[PDB]
Design a binder for this molecule. Structure first.
Ligand code: K
Ligand code: K
Ligand code: K
Ligand code: K
Ligand code: K
Ligand code: MG
Ligand code: MG
Ligand code: MG
Ligand code: MG
Ligand code: MG
Ligand code: MG
Ligand code: MG
Ligand code: MG
Ligand code: MG
Ligand code: MG
Ligand code: MG
Ligand code: MG
Ligand code: MG
Ligand code: MG
Ligand code: MG
Ligand code: MG
Ligand code: MG
Ligand code: MG
Ligand code: MG
Ligand code: MG
Ligand code: MG
Ligand code: MG
Ligand code: MG
Lengths: 132, 565, 49, 171, 327, 118, 101, 50
RNA sequence: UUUAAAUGGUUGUUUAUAAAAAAAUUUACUUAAA
RNA sequence: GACCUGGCGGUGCUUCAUAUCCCUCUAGAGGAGCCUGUUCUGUAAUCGAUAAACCCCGAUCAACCUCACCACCUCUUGCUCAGCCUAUAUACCGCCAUCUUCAGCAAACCCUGAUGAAGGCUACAAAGUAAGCGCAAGUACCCACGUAAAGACGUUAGGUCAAGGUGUAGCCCAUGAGGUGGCAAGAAAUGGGCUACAUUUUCUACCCCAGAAAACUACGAUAGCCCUUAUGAAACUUAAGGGUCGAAGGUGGAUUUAGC
């Protein structure tokens, strides 16, 4: 049996998001890519360095906003810009969000030497696609 | 593209949970974001190693770590220059002393640069990331000690010392040093003369005529030394002339007329100082009226550039005078000037921007048609500023004057969205206006829904933690609004609140409760109306009871009513 | 540069700005092993000699 | 390496070993069955080992109407914060160690004669708060399936009554 | 009392869309429809659903292969599943006399058809397909079994067999759908004229990776040029030349047309097959309709779909497996 | 807690007029914000007897590179402002043959636009 | 803080090889021709052989940057097949999907 | 802007590669990935530098 | 009705409850004086 | 003693299997040489897989490196707020094999068996209603075909502590780290593959109308030996080419693989 990225059936009580409900054979059929850059296009360079950066950013944001992220990040690269789109919860105070956005945008811009923006979208609770 | 009126300023996160919902949150949300940026910068400069891998092409110098520590450890004049460039007041002074003790030669230019650093900062370390009243100049300061040590003292050395003393409120000491400067037959620069003008006015408390003579004498010294005045020379004169409220008006105009003749173009700061001088607490404002009208005619359609540090204070002062004169056409001219080209950037800090727009919108509501007032309301709020609770009251008053009370429910919704849910003054004004007169059924229903919402706010007050207060007018108004809309059930519950909170019901509330009972024809309810008013000993109750007894009253209830009194 | 990534994120954890769930997990395990007596011995002064 | 660290959910799923061959067919019975502890419970955002006070995160943004600047708790002050944190953990841990006194039935380890409480309210706003439930038997019955072999099921006999003549039982 | 851990809010929580909710969704669609027309700079009053789909496709470009996963802006009536209305009032009395069956709509229809048959008894095709099961369930807004569907069709068929009035025929046509039958008739290419006024037809042919373009002239001597070369020189293998003869021989027109064809890709046999198809299709312009049908029934006008199958991983070929070892 | 938990304001699409200047809402390329786009757009493969997911918290819409900043109205307004920067092609050089006669040499160069820090 | 001691040894080899690349190229050029005298080419043979062993580029190994796996690494991403698949199957590699045809 | 433009679609490029299914052994079982590169070519003509 | 076709070490393959809480910031310039 | 469920039966009846069980169709493997695994034996000198479901398997790959092995030498807060390819895959996550070339799994209820383990269908219908998961449907490739992909719950404590992470236990002047050198063989057996034994062939031209060859100078080595070249710092060894050499092999026992 295949295992890769398959949330397995429970008793019908496990809430899954839309991304977590779709196995890898749906990645260009029902769900899209969580990162969009040019590295993996034919004749394009630096796929390796883009990959390491994405892995770091997903770890950085998970620990920088502990317990706030409601789904996976969407990383966007346009020219020199990097845009991180995160769906967060409405539990942490707004003052703490603004502090962390100013902190993460500055720290990451100096680390990867490029303008970085963080676009937060808040949800009251985790969006449940189905109960598995 | 133009400003989006539905959105808050671009600096904020465009999310309903994170968008600022009040004027205070507007300030604090930005301060929190700035704090985050400072914390990140503190880490970047604390651990440069982690941010030294440069992967950017072209290279971005601004995204590299900063090094603030001197990297030359040799004791020499060239190594000292570094500490002065780094603005290390204590390191530089200590090294200069060590250099002098060793006996090596320090150039006059290097010594002058050290004095500039010491004089500007008052021999105190500039603020760093991490490690008002009174005269900041101190007699036992490093600047004075080094100044005497200097073997050769040129004109610039004296100049920077005079400017330092005036900057730090050592006015008398600065004037004494200028006297020494003159004794040495050394010409002073424009900037020293500008500081000296301030010194003479602040130093002594003489009457205007004496101070004016002193200022004029410095200007004559300036001409004698072939020193050409700059814009700041005149702006300091006008700023200094603000203490003498009514004596400097004509002299101040002479200073302005002199500027134009010489060729120095008055900036926004120049006119700011003038209008502040001419606009003192006086009811006529006859002179102020002429000045502002003439100033606005001159400034019409002029694109400005930053010339004086006080250029940002003009618009708030201009709008404040327009509100005092209550001239809407003048206010539109002031705002017109703000909107031409890039003049909007001179509005100033946040508290300046809020004051300007508060005075501007308060004048619109008062002096303009309601249909245009509502357009300004939509364009300015929240995209330009977050309204004060008092500006919502002015808007409600404008709606009353215009007889457009169908908008009152919307104003309440907006007020709650702008952080005025629990403002007592605003809640009482809305209820009073809604209940002041009777309205058609549809408008009466809407007012009942708004009253029910205002009631929920009173119930859910956060002040409850301290104490919960139900004003008498608020309670009376809410009850009347429920009765007029036909929600008698809800109104009957309010009757308990009056006695609970010890609030006296108005006669109009009691007189109108009759019909509600008569339409129902329930004598029991009619007595309840009599019972309450009797508790408060209202004179209308006794006369009222007799009429109720005639209309609808049970025999057994009639006897009890009289004895209860 | 694994040295930079590891050292940066360790500094940010000690500063309170990064929560390392993994490091927290192995700090709790290492803490429970001290109460159980399975503590790392002193270097040089080990069981053997 | 920072890149080999996993999340808490992955670390606990491996360490607990709740899904494995050891649990499929009564294969491994361990009294020392490991329990999950949430290590983010008492943690505050912005609190670290160095004790820095970040305005607007760890500490209030404005104090005395002025924006606070970056500060660091003194050594002795940080020791108190760290000691208090240890005490809080021990107290929380203590609560879980405490055993609540269960009223025993016919025997200490028997299910017979233990109350199950009132029957659950019916969908149509129906209530049985007068009725009391008591277990009578709990049996581990077994059937054999082609795929899994022994399939364990629970058979429970319970009686219910209000104490005023109305009583019943069901399996 | 030992407290059984109580159930939370039902996790499944099957979503029901009440009629008020649908009404609010319709209001939202109408306002959004006006916003979308305003965004695209079109007239709000003539903005159709096909303009909405075009605008949404441009504004929210999605390449997801499955179209049901792409961003959609449709009328709530087309999005939300059709839901049966409340079947009883406040008093609790159901509204239908066949409610307690559980299939009031199905059994009410069954009752109606039986009644019509009784009255009919007392009184006395190719395009249309019987409504399928999934579509009948939609009409009735009820779940049916396969055997329930069969029973209904049997009555409907029985009703048609007996004589029927205007009313009964209309009722049946409610449950009959339209089948558009594709015609298996070859499309004839236009007869063009060259600079000299000679009539010719041009068609294309594909076989494996070979692609041919054939120009068949109405009148000729039987000369075939392949890529500018005489066909016997281009195709030295006899079998290949036999393939070029088959289209013309089958219609008894050997030596009556000239052909100038260009072929690329594939091997020797695929190229001869591609030319055979291109020539047969172009030759259809100069033969009778009946002859075109004979050509189609001889396999001369069908594109051969047999193409090389891909090799799979873990096998030797498309089908050939690796040697299996029992032990 | 002195108040209750901070309540999110209603989405600002409820204040937007149906005849607004949309280019002012999305002046530049920005991620899809459900509270700023006044369209009831849905996305996501529907579950059985279900509908595509709504736009709030919809990560599939967030993954799309939207063209909300490039509506036909905006592009036309943008190009009117950019006409000042353009210069006129020589009218004499009508055809390619005319270009070759007056300008015999042709230089080809290529520029590559990729995403990244370098 | 590298994944293991093996990765750390490869990091040092890549660094030493970089430092000596120019010297090795210059000496190797002297040897890779028939123009120069054989006596000179023999001295160059000894000189390049006396350079540190870890400067030899053939000793560098393309290990997975995340796990240090020395085999099964895809050069374009510098990732082992296992790590690559983990990122690809979660939709975190731009434009990489499961192939069916 | 008054520019003469013509658009065509160059043929797409699909790069495919194969990886092992399991972490250890089971060589017969593979996972096959691909990267699709689609093209569009805008051909402008008769422009000036500005 | 209808050829023959023996074997597979020992022991191991089933019961007691569930789950933290938090806290606020606290509405509208410029300026100056002694 | 009597039952329930499942398994099994050299158990009955009926209907079937579509590369499939038999008969049949085509090309192969088991014989020879060589290449490459494995087992045994050997070596101071890894490990793992190892009925079907191991055996060109982890490796889309080992001259040093890789490396985890052996010998010798060296280091001790050590690239790391250490480290360990040390034990346990019978503690696990992760990724999988297998039945599956399957169609079943199943919460929540209801009813039957006197309220036992358990069981629940008949359509001219007799107690079942069933969310969810899988199949299916959709999607990818050239179609609606085909092929991919997909394929639940479970079965074999199946595979993998040596991808990485990790529970438990163990080592900490050593079971850790580094340097130099070195082993990776064939008595024997065996799996898979390659090339052959030729005339539907061999060589050349050509790419399908040719001329020669055709049995001890034929067919037949990608082996042996010698030389050269390529890569590398390092090649008796790795690869390529040339020369020399011209062996077994003459269509293969029991048995056995694949294909619609
Ligand atoms: K035993
Ligand atoms: K049986
Ligand atoms: K054979
Ligand atoms: K073989
Ligand atoms: K372990
Ligand atoms: Mg498989
Ligand atoms: Mg006991
Ligand atoms: Mg084949
Ligand atoms: Mg190598
Ligand atoms: Mg025996
Ligand atoms: Mg046995
Ligand atoms: Mg053989
Ligand atoms: Mg082995
Ligand atoms: Mg083994
Ligand atoms: Mg070695
Ligand atoms: Mg080796
Ligand atoms: Mg070891
Ligand atoms: Mg196992
Ligand atoms: Mg198909
Ligand atoms: Mg398959
Ligand atoms: Mg399927
Ligand atoms: Mg095992
Ligand atoms: Mg094993
Ligand atoms: Mg060792
Ligand atoms: Mg041969
Ligand atoms: Mg040879
Ligand atoms: Mg060589
Ligand atoms: Mg020969």
């Amino acid at each position: 049996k295949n295992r890769a990225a398959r949330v397995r059936v429970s008793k019908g009580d496990k809430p899954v998001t839309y991304e977590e409900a779709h196995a890898p054979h749906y990645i260009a059929h029902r769900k899209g890519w969580l990162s969009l850059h040019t590295g993996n296009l034919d004749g394009e360079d630096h796929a390796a360095e883009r990959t390491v950066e994405d892995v770091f950013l997903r770890k950085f944001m998970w620990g920088t906003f502990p317990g706030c992220l409601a789904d996976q990040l969407v990383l966007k690269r346009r020219g020199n810009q990097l845009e991180i789109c995160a769906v967060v919860l409405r539990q942490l105070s707004p003052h703490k969000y603004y502090f962390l956005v100013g902190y993460s945008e500055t720290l990451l811009s100096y680390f990867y030497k490029c303008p970085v923006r963080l676009h937060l979208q808040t949800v009251p609770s985790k969006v449940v696609y189905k109960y598995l | 593209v133009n400003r989006d009126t539905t959105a808050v300023p671009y600096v904020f996160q465009d999310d309903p949970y994170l968008m600022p919902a009040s004027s205070l949150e507007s300030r604090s949300f930005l301060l929190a974001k700035k704090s985050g940026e400072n914390v990140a910068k503190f880490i970047i400069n604390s651990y440069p190693k982690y941010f030294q891998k440069d992967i950017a092409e072209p290279h971005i110098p601004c995204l590299m770590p900063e090094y603030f520590e001197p990297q030359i450890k040799d004791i020499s004049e060239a190594a000292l220059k570094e500490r002065i460039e780094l603005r290390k007041v204590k390191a530089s002074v200590d090294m200069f002393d060590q250099l002098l003790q060793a006996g090596t030669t320090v150039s006059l230019e290097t010594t002058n640069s050290l004095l500039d650093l010491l004089c500007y900062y008052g021999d105190q370390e500039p603020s760093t990331d991490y490690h008002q009243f009174g005269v900041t100049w101190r007699a036992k300061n490093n600047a004075e000690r080094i100044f005497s040590l200097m073997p050769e003292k040129n004109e610039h050395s004296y100049c920077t010392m005079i400017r330092g003393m005036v900057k730090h409120r050592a006015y008398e000491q600065a004037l004494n040093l200028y006297t020494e400067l003159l004794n040495n037959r050394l010409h002073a620069d424009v900037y020293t003369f500008n500081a000296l003008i301030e010194a003479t006015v602040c130093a002594i408390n003489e009457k205007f005529e004496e101070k004016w003579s002193k200022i004029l004498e410095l200007l004559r010294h300036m001409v004698a030394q072939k020193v050409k005045p700059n814009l700041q020379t005149f702006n300091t004169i006008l700023k200094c002339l603000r203490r003498f409220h009514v004596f400097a008006r004509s002299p101040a105009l002479q200073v302005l007329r002199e500027m134009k003749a010489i060729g120095i173009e008055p900036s926004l700061a120049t006119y700011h100082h003038i209008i502040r001088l001419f606009d003192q607490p006086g009811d006529p404002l006859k002179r102020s009226s002429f000045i502002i009208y003439d100033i606005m005619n001159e400034l019409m359609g002029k694109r400005f550039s930053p010339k004086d540090p006080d250029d940002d204070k003009f618009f708030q002062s201009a709008m404040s005078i327009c509100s005092s004169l209550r001239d809407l056409e003048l206010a539109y001219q002031v705002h017109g000037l703000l909107k031409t080209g890039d003049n909007w950037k001179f509005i100033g800090p946040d508290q300046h921007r809020n004051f300007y727009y508060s005075k501007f919108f308060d004048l619109i509501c008062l002096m303009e048609q309601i249909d245009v007032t509502l357009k300004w309301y939509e364009d300015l709020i929240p995209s330009a500023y977050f309204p004060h609770s008092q500006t919502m009251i002015h808007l409600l008053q404008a709606l009353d004057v215009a007889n457009r009370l169908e908008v009152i429910p919307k104003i309440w919704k907006d007020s709650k969205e702008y952080g005025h849910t629990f403002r007592s003054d605003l809640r009482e004004e809305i209820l009073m206006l809604m209940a002041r007169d009777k309205h058609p059924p549809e408008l009466q229903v809407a007012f009942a829904d708004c009253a029910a919402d205002i009631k929920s706010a009173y119930e859910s007050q956060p002040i409850r933690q301290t104490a919960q207060d139900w004003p008498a007018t608020s309670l009376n108004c809410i009850a009347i609004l429920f009765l007029r809309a036909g929600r008698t059930q809800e109104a009957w519950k309010m009757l308990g609140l009056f006695r609970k909170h010890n609030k006296i019901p108005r006669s109009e509330l009691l007189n109108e409760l009759m019909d509600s009972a008569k339409v129902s024809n329930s004598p029991s309810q009619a007595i309840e109306v009599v019972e309450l008013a009797s508790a408060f000993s209202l004179p209308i109750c006794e006369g009222l009871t007799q009429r109720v007894m005639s209309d609808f009253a049970i025999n057994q209830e009639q006897k009890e009513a009289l004895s209860n009194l | 540069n694994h040295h930079t990534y590891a050292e940066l994120m360790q500094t940010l954890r000690f500063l309170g700005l990064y929560r390392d769930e993994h490091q927290d997990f192995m700090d709790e395990q290492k803490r429970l092993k001290k109460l159980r007596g399975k503590e790392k011995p002193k270097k040089g002064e080990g069981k053997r000699a | 390496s920072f890149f080999t660290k996993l999340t808490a959910d992955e670390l606990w799923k491996g360490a607990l070993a709740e899904t494995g061959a050891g649990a499929k067919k009564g294969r491994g019975k361990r009294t020392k069955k490991k329990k999950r502890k949430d290590l983010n419970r008492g943690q505050i955002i912005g609190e670290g080992r160095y004790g820095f006070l970040w305005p607007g995160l760890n500490v209030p943004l404005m104090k005395n109407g002025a924006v606070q600047t970056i500060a660091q708790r003194s050594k002795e002050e940080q020791e108190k914060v760290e000691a208090d944190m240890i005490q809080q953990r021990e107290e929380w841990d203590r609560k879980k160690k405490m055993k609540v006194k269960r009223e025993r039935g016919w025997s200490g380890n028997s299910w017979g004669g233990i109350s199950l409480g009132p029957p659950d309210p019916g969908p149509c706003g129906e209530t049985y708060e007068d009725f009391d439930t008591r277990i009578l038997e709990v049996r581990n019955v077994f059937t054999m399936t082609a795929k899994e072999g022994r399939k364990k099921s629970i058979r429970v006999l319970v009686a219910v009554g209000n104490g005023k003549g109305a009583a019943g039982f069901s399996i | 009392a030992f407290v059984i851990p109580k159930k939370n809010v039902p996790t499944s929580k099957r979503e029901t869309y009440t009629e008020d909710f649908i009404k609010k969704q319709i209001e939202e669609f109408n306002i959004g429809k006006r916003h979308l027309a305003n965004m695209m700079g079109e007239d709000p009053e003539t903005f159709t659903q096909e303009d909405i789909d075009r605008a949404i496709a441009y504004l929210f470009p999605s390449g997801l292969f499955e179209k049901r996963a792409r961003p959609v802006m449709k009328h709530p009536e087309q999005i939300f599943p059709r839901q049966r209305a409340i079947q009883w009032g406040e008093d609790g009395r159901p509204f239908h006399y066949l409610f307690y069956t559980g299939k009031q709509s199905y059994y009410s229809l069954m009752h109606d058809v039986y009644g019509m048959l009784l009255n009919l008894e007392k009184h006395q095709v190719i395009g249309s397909r019987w409504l399928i099961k999934e579509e009948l369930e939609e009409m009735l807004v009820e779940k049916l079994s396969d055997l329930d569907y069969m029973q209904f069709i049997r009555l409907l068929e029985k009703l048609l067999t007996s004589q029927c009035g205007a009313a009964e025929e209309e009722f049946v046509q409610r449950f009959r759908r339209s089948v558009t039958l594709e015609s298996k008739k070859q499309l004839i290419e236009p007869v063009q004229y060259d600079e000299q006024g000679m009539a010719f037809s041009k068609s294309e042919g594909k076989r494996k990776t070979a692609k041919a373009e054939a120009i068949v002239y109405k009148h000729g001597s039987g000369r075939i040029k392949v890529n500018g070369i005489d066909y016997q020189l281009y195709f030295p293998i006899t079998q290949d030349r036999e393939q070029l003869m088959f289209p013309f021989h089958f219609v008894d027109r050997l030596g009556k047309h000239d052909v100038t064809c260009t072929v690329s890709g594939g091997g020797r046999s695929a190229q001869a097959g591609a030319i055979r198809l291109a020539m047969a299709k172009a030759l259809c312009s100069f033969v009778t309709e009946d002859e075109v049908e004979w050509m189609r029934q001889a396999g001369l006008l069908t594109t051969d779909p047999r193409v090389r199958e891909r090799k799979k991983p873990g096998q030797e070929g498309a089908r050939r497996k690796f040697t299996w070892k029992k032990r | 807690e002195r108040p209750p938990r901070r309540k999110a304001l209603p989405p600002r699409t409820e204040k937007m007029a149906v005849d607004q200047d949309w280019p002012s809402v999305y002046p530049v390329a920005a991620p899809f914000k459900p509270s700023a786009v006044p369209l009831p757009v849905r996305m996501g493969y529907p579950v059985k007897k279900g509908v595509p997911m709504a736009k709030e918290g919809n990560l599939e819409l967030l993954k799309i590179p939207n063209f909300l900043h490039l509506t036909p109205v905006a592009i036309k307004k943008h190009c009117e402002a950019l006409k000042d920067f353009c210069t006129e092609w020589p009218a004499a050089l009508d055809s390619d043959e005319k270009c070759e006669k007056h300008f015999p040499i042709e230089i080809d160069s290529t520029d590559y636009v990729s995403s990244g820090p370098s | 803080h590298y994944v293991d001691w093996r990765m750390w040894r490869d990091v040092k080899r890549r660094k030493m090889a970089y430092e000596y690349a120019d010297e090795r190229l210059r000496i190797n050029s002297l040897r890779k021709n028939t123009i120069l005298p054989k006596i000179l080419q023999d001295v160059a043979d000894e000189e390049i052989a006396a350079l540190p062993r870890d400067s030899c580029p053939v000793r560098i190994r393309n290990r997975c940057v995340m796990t240090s796996r020395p085999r099964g690494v895809k050069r374009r991403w510098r990732l082992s097949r296992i790590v690559f698949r983990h990122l690809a199957d979660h939709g975190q590699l731009s434009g990489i999907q499961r192939a069916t045809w | 802007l008054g520019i003469s433009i013509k658009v065509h679609e160059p043929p797409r490029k699909i790069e495919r590669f194969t990886l092992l299914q399991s972490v250890h052994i089971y060589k017969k079982h593979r996972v096959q990935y691909e990267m699709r590169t689609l093209y569009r070519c805008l051909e402008l003509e008769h422009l000036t530098g500005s």
